[PDB]
Point group: D2
Chain length 314, copies 4
């Protein structure tokens, strides 16, 4: 095979038509503007390729066979590696001064008229709240959030008739807080009762299903109450073999959120720089990470009974 024919460089390297050169006088920096956007769109296509493949593994049921956890986590890690390079790619646009941009700015019609289809498809496919047919599919089809929520709802250890994680956790937090109240009641004392009455209210709020449902309606929550429990199960028992790679998956999901927001931040700054001057899908994963529960209150697991913690399924 010929290198250029394999990469279809006759299409890729023949798609740089300068609008300044077309509509009048050529402006040198417009070529940088065109290539940078083409480079972003090539990487958006790759991020969609990796995202749809991971979505397929969940949707078609392959994620149930736990041999595919390495491939899901690996591909989610690749998405964040690509996103890290896209955040670094802003440094190239920084080399184009605002004064030079205003030279070719006239040939770019209204700026509030350009919108990336692939970026919108990517946001929709993750779960952010002819070309229109593709957009209608991205909004209708199962998002990476919905597919991760369904999988979190099936987390081992949640079943009330088995391990009953939420029941044990609630009882342990209640019994642990009673010991704390006793220890405190036995200026420093008057201040520690306020620090306790605040920690108690926060910890017990986790067991209020009606408050979670209210927050889901207000847009402050995305995951269902059962998916929230499955994620918290993976968090506290992350060292247990069955939850080690699933813990890396929850981490990757949060990383992709941090990087998409960091990219969005960089983008807004570049837009405000050239034209003159919430989005976290996995907020629940960030929120569960910020729960002050002592490791000694986490329900202890018996290896003689709870074989699920160290036995994998296909």
């Amino acid at each position: 095979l010929i290198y250029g024919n394999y990469l279809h460089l006759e299409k890729v390297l023949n798609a740089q038509e300068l609008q300044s050169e077309t509509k009048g006088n050529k402006i040198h920096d417009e070529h940088l503007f065109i290539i940078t956007h083409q480079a972003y769109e090539l990487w958006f296509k790759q991020i969609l390729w990796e995202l749809d493949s991971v979505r397929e593994i969940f949707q078609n049921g392959h994620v149930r066979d736990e041999r595919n956890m390495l491939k899901v986590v690996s591909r989610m890690h690749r998405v964040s590696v690509i996103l890290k390079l896209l955040v670094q790619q802003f440094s190239i646009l920084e080399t184009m001064t605002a004064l030079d941009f205003n030279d070719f700015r006239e040939y770019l019609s209204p700026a509030s008229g350009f919108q990336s289809l692939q970026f919108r498809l990517l946001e929709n496919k993750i779960g952010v709240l002819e070309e229109n047919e593709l957009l209608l599919k991205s909004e209708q089809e199962k998002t990476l959030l919905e597919l991760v929520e369904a999988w979190l709802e099936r987390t081992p250890g949640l079943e009330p008739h088995g391990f009953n994680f939420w029941g044990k956790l609630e009882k342990n937090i209640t019994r642990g807080l009673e010991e704390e109240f006793i220890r405190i009641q036995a200026e420093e004392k008057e201040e520690q009762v306020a620090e306790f009455q605040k920690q108690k209210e926060v910890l017990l709020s986790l067991f209020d299903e009606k408050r979670h449902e209210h927050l889901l309606s207000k847009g402050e929550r995305r995951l269902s109450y059962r998916a929230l429990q499955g994620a918290l199960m993976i968090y506290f028992y992350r060292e247990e073999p069955r939850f080690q790679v699933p813990f890396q998956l929850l981490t990757s999901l949060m990383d992709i959120d941090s990087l998409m927001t960091k990219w969005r931040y960089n983008h807004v700054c570049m837009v405000h720089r050239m034209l003159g001057s919430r989005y976290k899908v996995f907020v629940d994963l960030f929120n569960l990470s910020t729960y002050l529960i002592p490791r000694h209150w986490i329900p202890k697991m018996n290896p003689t009974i709870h074989k699920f913690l160290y036995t994998a399924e296909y």
Copy 2:
């Protein structure tokens, strides 16, 4: 204008034909392999765009009007910023394990744009483009000609090389006297060797015949007069006329460091999947010349107006 029509996304986003999917069974990682190479080639086209424009400014004589120094230095800096991102772009190929590569390896070269870039900088139908890059004036040759016209070299005027030679000679004689006076010791017996080595190196700078010999052996690239112009820019870099030209010599060295770092990363990735060439060596060499700042010939503002007066 429509965004996708402006970027010609109908060509760009419809050029990913997987050879595994075509010749049999689709291998997922092959899409990453295709996009990464297409991304490199888009940036190679940009580096050639910036390089040819800078080359044009020198070749057509616009570089003589010093208003274009900001544009040359700015564009050379941009090339290094793109090269920095291309070195980082190797991390994406690293996400493809060697074992996954062997799955699509059965269905699988030389980059024309990379070769055109190397040729255009001065590294020692598609073939017509290659023949032009080898024949046309390189960025090194164009920079050499411009360095040959550096103000202050003229023997009838500032005579930089004459003043510098006398100052280095008189300064080294003081050093020999200062060392031979020190008491016979281990420090004195060692500093005579450190002096006889520094003297041989410093005085070699004024041997034009040795420079010409080294140019033939490939050890030097710039002419003896271009070498003097570059060293003039180095020592008088704080003088207004040489501030932006100093940044240009720095950018040229940066591009060499980054091309070599890219080449290093490339070789490692090739050896990972399938189991010197510094154009501006003279700019690196002149940066490593141990000359005390008090030996640099001083310049009088009443006589040497060239140091603070620009030309168009």
Copy 3:
């Protein structure tokens, strides 16, 4: 000299006292937390070293000798290189999970009680709106913004008796806009003509606002402007004539100043995210005027032309 003695490694490498190990049981990740903060503080000390030296060059008058422009621009570039590494340094804290942080979180007393003195000194020295004595000096002494403002007020070409840049610019913008109004009113009464009069009446109001000194003074009181009206003109002079030899390196300095603002804000953004991640969840731009002047839609053909036979200042440097 001995390597460790030169770097004072007996002080540097003997300053890692884990509070978890001290007050109870050792938590491994607390060492990463301590070293990362010590690394940030070493770079903050370096940024203050470079910043104070640049501030000294302006304040002591050395910036008047234009041989020091390469050294000012070089050091401002270094500050942004250090800041870029500090933004990348957040990736190391990302390696510490929130769950691991909660293990040593108890030994760190109230978080709303820790404050970096050096970060505050750095913000004050740039111009962001015994240890307290150092802070009092940073707030009282001349900021990098005030020192850059004074230098911008002396930009060649502003003098009304000489080049008179603001006068020429105002006349050219006024005469150019009148031709635009005539060109638009000549076009046949259509949807394109009725829409271009709105695009013109908006561009005219924006362009002519640049010559309203009373509006600039009003915006300076509201905090929307930082530079004086004359410093604003000096910066715009450097912008339009940036290719002229005398303004090439000063243009790079205005660019560095804006870069430092973008990077300080990008660092602040990264910091807030890391704080919200571990403890549960244009104002700070000193050089806003430099960003604003970059966004002024003036056609290059309206920029007052310069005669080399008369305007020798554009290509002749001063000491």
Copy 4:
């Protein structure tokens, strides 16, 4: 607690004594030189902190309880993340021109980093001297990883017998290839594929020559033992099987650390030459096993009804 007291900023921020300012006239860039080296040394201390903790987990036997695999892999990943930042930290020294360095070069006389040497020794690269003697004598990360690879499940000849099954499959697969090639008509493609086969066969069959591996280990060309080599290759081919997913990430981390240490060494040599005018790869065996052209259909198949070790963890 006070922020500066917690970080001991009275030691950290009061350790910058410029030798140019001390021995005569202050050279501004010397402060950058001192802080950059102090920043490297702070990160070297952190890399040693993470490395010793991982080494302890192996040496004291905690690595046998597989609940600690997340903590080993996580910490090895952290070392690479710090090393990535140290490679980026060279860009700061690049802001100091060679000409500016020669201004303070006279006050610097030869120096050697003890922590860098301790780090190289602790990974397994082939009063302060007491610390160096301990790093050379104590078990390296390579030796501790080798011992753990020697106990990889599936190697046991009485059980799964990975090496036996693999050898038979490679032998039978190569015979099919020889037959398939010799059948092809005498052509330029046929005359070239016999050379490509005789080279691939010699390479693949060399993997089962224990005497050649022992000889290469003595010549320094190999680091891991023959059994550790088999355990690593077992983790490679069965990386998708639950028990080998996290151990595969560990072998990847170990190779990453080698790639990054080499990239750091490259950057260092360039910066040294700029201011003053497979050998070091500890895990060469992990890189070598990654470059073994074996078709996935020749990998011995595993039965879940019999081979419960692939999906059952141990404590």
